[PDB]
Design a protein around this ligand. Structure first.
Ligand SMILES: O=C(O)CN(CC(=O)O)CC(=O)O
Ligand SMILES: [Fe+3]
Length: 339
């Protein structure tokens, strides 16, 4: 009847859930795992981050489910169709938020149950507990628990190997989040976020000691001085976009991915790293930084870090299984890339 969310708040599970508000649109990644062939049927509103910041995934859904464009966008901008203060008109049974608000207050003041999850700041600790909570409060425990089993299995395949690797034998690693996005450079993950995936994949994240939190910045000069064994760039850029950025996602091929990475690797400063010269330079889909599908990032990283140990591991296969079992769309495009 009650469950504890990732804020440690006790929440009363509603007996009927037909109407789900997503405080962050990209929480749809999690919800989608639960809704089988009816992904949108219970979504009554969402913030626009999925539609606006994941145009590629949105577009694939829109192809098969045009109704996605009718889902109200909650926010205060001209791109939004319903302001926080009026979200009660949507009659949500429950509202889902990330840990990372006037909206939350408005919903709590209306007696709407609010559940906090987290795939962003501490994914290693919080991914699976988040999914468990979601299975319970959205009445999809079978789907949650099967996903939990699938994720555990697929993570173990890595960690049963990477946990036995001595630290001195581990590659040093630097991930540049949204490489080529802002003008200043080297937004990264430290004690959390994609850091967790580096850790689980047997890497040594050079930003871990440089940052107090999960997310932060390391100046290029420090990246260049440290000169890690491995360089990773995250991005989710449209393959039709000339702005610098790694093009990855549902609508990107390998060749477009490689090409856009190459532009990122050719940047002044970055092009002097040994990792770039050695070709130990890689691209990862940015939205794995806030998604329960992050098992695929862990598997990708492991393959880059220990290519021999993970010769037979194929994240594209892992992804295929995830889609087959849980999702109403087919897997397409490119979510990781090598030089
Ligand atoms: O999440 C957002 O609203 C915007 N992002 C970029 C992105 O996620 O594409 C910055 C950040 O989360 O630091
Ligand atoms: Fe972001």
């Amino acid at each position: 009847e009650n469950i504890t969310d990732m804020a440690g708040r006790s929440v009363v599970i509603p007996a009927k859930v037909e109407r789900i508000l997503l405080g962050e649109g990209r929480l749809f990644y999690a919800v989608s795992l639960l809704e089988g062939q009816k992904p949108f049927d219970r979504i009554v509103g969402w913030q626009g981050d999925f539609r606006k910041l994941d145009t590629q995934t949105y577009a694939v859904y829109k192809a098969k489910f045009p109704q996605v464009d009718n889902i109200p966008l909650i926010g205060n901008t001209t791109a939004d169709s319903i302001s926080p203060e009026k979200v009660l008109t949507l009659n949500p049974d429950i509202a889902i938020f990330g840990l990372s608000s006037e909206l939350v207050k408005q919903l709590e003041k209306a007696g709407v149950p609010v559940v906090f999850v987290d795939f962003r700041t501490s994914p290693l600790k919080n991914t699976l507990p988040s999914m468990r909570v979601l299975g319970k409060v959205l009445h999809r425990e079978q789907q949650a628990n099967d996903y939990i089993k699938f994720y555990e299995d697929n993570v173990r395949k890595v960690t049963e190997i990477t946990s036995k690797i001595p630290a001195d034998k581990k590659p040093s690693v630097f991930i540049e989040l949204r490489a080529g996005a802002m003008e200043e450079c080297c937004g990264t993950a430290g004690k959390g976020n994609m850091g967790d995936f580096i850790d689980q994949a047997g890497g040594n994240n050079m930003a871990k000691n440089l940052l107090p939190g999960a997310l932060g910045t390391v100046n290029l000069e420090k990246v260049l001085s440290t000169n890690p064994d491995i360089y990773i760039a995250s991005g989710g850029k449209a393959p039709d976009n000339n702005a610098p950025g790694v093009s990855l996602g549902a609508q990107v091929t390998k060749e477009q991915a490689q090409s856009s990475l190459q532009t990122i690797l050719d940047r002044k400063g970055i092009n002097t790293l040994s990792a770039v010269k050695n070709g130990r330079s890689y691209g990862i889909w940015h939205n794995f930084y806030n998604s329960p599908y992050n098992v695929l990032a862990i598997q990708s990283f492991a393959k880059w870090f220990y290519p021999q140990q993970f010769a037979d591991l194929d994240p594209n296969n892992t992804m295929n299984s995830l889609y087959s079992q849980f999702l109403a769309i087919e897997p397409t495009g490119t979510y990781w890339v090598d030089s």
